[PDB]
Every structure is written in structure tokens, then in C-alpha cells.
């Protein structure tokens, strides 16, 4: 299977969308496992919203 | 430490402790062979002397 998870974040949390991380997003909003397989893709969308 | 960090430290201890135990067992097998040879000689002397 392939699962595509999607959400809005601030630029300073971009680093938290990764396995093995801690912080307000990594711990309370969106967490990846240490044994994570997949790709994290992100972009600046300030010219849209 | 939390698991992603704790496992790294544990891995080092497992490697070292497993190596130490393997060294012990190898030495006991070699020493056991020497004892076996002595016991065989003792058994021969019992029968012939």
C-alpha cells in the first residue's frame, strides 16, 4: 500500500516531520516511527494562501 | 535514553558481552579436551597398572 498523509505547518516545524524527532509537532500532532519507510515532501505555499 | 538512542548504547554492550562469552566458551572447549586426554590416560593406567 501507499499512504499519502497531508497537513499544514509553519516553516519552523518542517524539521519535525521526520522519524526519531521530538517537539510539539513530533510528539502531539504528527509522529513518524523510528523504523520509518517512506518520503517526506514539503514546499513553500505562501504564494497560494 | 529513549529507544532510538538507548538501542545504540545497548548494541555496543551486546557486542562486547557476546564476544566475552564466546571467548570463555572457546577456552573451556580447548581446556576440556586436555582434561579428556588426561582422563583417558588415567583410565588406561587403571586397567593396565
Amino acid at each position: 500500500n501507499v499512504y499519502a498523509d497531508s497537513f499544514v505547518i509553519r516553516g519552523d516545524w518542517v524539521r519535525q516531520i521526520a522519524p526519531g524527532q521530538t517537539g510539539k509537532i513530533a510528539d502531539y500532532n504528527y509522529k513518524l516511527p523510528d523504523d520509518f519507510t517512506g518520503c517526506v515532501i514539503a514546499w513553500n505555499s505562501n504564494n497560494l494562501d | 535514553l529513549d529507544p532510538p538512542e538507548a538501542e545504540v548504547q545497548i548494541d555496543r554492550l551486546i557486542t562486547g558481552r557476546l564476544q566475552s562469552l564466546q571467548t570463555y566458551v572457546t577456552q573451556q572447549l580447548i581446556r576440556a579436551a586436555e582434561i579428556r586426554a588426561s582422563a583417558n590416560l588415567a583410565a588406561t593406567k587403571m586397567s593396565e597398572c
Binding site: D12, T22, G23, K24 | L1, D2, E5
Partner: protein, 49 residues
């Protein structure tokens, strides 16, 4: 009120007390909260010299 310059940093000794670190960890204000050798959520279960 005032923090020292980096060339002449200050040092405060903490002793004879109860150290509750959850007030800082959960405190939402920081950009960085990075622990080395210890985990930020296990600090209250530790004792220090």
C-alpha cells in the same frame, strides 16, 4: 532581566532543591530544546549531584 554576553557567560548553581523540568519542556516558548545523554521527558525521574 539581563543575560550576559557570550564572551562572558554567567553560571547559576542549582542545589538543595526539587527540579521540575516539565514546566520548561511543556512551556510552549522555546525554539530549541535539545537534550544530550538524557531524555527531556524523563528528567523528573532523575537525580543529580
Amino acid at each position: 532581566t539581563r543575560f550576559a554576553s557570550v564572551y562572558a557567560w554567567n553560571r547559576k548553581r542549582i542545589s538543595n532543591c526539587v527540579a521540575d523540568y516539565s514546566v520548561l519542556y511543556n512551556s510552549a516558548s522555546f525554539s530549541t530544546f535539545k537534550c544530550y545523554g538524557v531524555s527531556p521527558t524523563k528528567l523528573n525521574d532523575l537525580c543529580f549531584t
